[PDB]
Amino acid sequence: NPKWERTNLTYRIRNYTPQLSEAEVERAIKDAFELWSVASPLIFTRISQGEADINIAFYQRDHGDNSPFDGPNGILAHAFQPGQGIGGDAHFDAEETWTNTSANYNLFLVAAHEFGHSLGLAHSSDPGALMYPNYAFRETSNYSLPQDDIDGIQAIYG
Ligand SMILES: CNC(=O)[C@H](Cc1ccccc1)NC(=O)[C@H](CC(C)C)[C@H](CSc1cccs1)C(=O)NO
Numbered sequence: 001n002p003k004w005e006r007t008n009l010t011y012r013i014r015n016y017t018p019q020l021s022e023a024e025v026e027r028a029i030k031d032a033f034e035l036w037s038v039a040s041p042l043i044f045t046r047i048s049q050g051e052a053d054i055n056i057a058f059y060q061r062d063h064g065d066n067s068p069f070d071g072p073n074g075i076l077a078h079a080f081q082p083g084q085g086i087g088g089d090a091h092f093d094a095e096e097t098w099t100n101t102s103a104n105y106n107l108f109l110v111a112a113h114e115f116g117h118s119l120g121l122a123h124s125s126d127p128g129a130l131m132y133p134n135y136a137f138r139e140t141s142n143y144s145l146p147q148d149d150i151d152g153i154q155a156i157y158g
């Protein structure tokens with residue numbers, strides 16, 4: 001079971017998607033990290049440059065990691081378990097339509113799922129859990145972590 005042995009973790013957004021403003025992309029990402037912080041001892045801090053523990057980027061098809069994206073729909077993004085280098089990093093398929101509405105696909109909810117992986121969680125069979133393998137829209141305005149997900153990070157950290 002891999003976990004971070006440090007509690008303040010830095011993150012960096014390496015590039016952006018044109019469908020959303022830079023401010024909307026930063027808001028989506030920020031809020032997704034907050035979901036996990038309120039249920040664990042982790043604190044996330046944004047750096048504008050340099051080496052972050054968690055790199056976030058929008059890539060297309062082959063992008064250097066041996067797990068190529070597949071164009072519109074299908075796989076939306078992926079993330080690496082806690083660790084050095086690529087460890088903890090999160091990639092989003094630049095070919096998807098990214099939104100901040102109920103329309104396919106809501107960047108905040110997909111980001112919240114990937115960050116679960118960056119922190120060490122695996123998929124859940126509970127269809128109501130954020131860590132479930134298939135994407136499903138749920139209201140986001142005052143969204144909070146499902147109980148199955150809370151049990152999950154609490155079991156790793158505390
Ligand atoms: C509408 N499309 C989907 O719901 C696709 C379909 C899919 C799921 C699993 C396997 C193959 C295809 N799901 C995703 O894009 C997942 C992310 C969503 C929940 C935001 C994405 C799947 S890729 C991986 C498979 C196994 C380990 S990572 C993911 O878990 N990344 O962390």
Ligand SMILES: [Ca+2]
Pocket residue numbers: 052053054055083084085086087088089
């Ligand atoms: Ca990393």
Ligand SMILES: [Ca+2]
Pocket residue numbers: 069070071072073074075076093095096
């Ligand atoms: Ca895709």
Ligand SMILES: [Zn+2]
Pocket residue numbers: 063065067078091
């Ligand atoms: Zn990748």
Ligand SMILES: [Zn+2]
Pocket residue numbers: 113114117123133
């Ligand atoms: Zn996943």
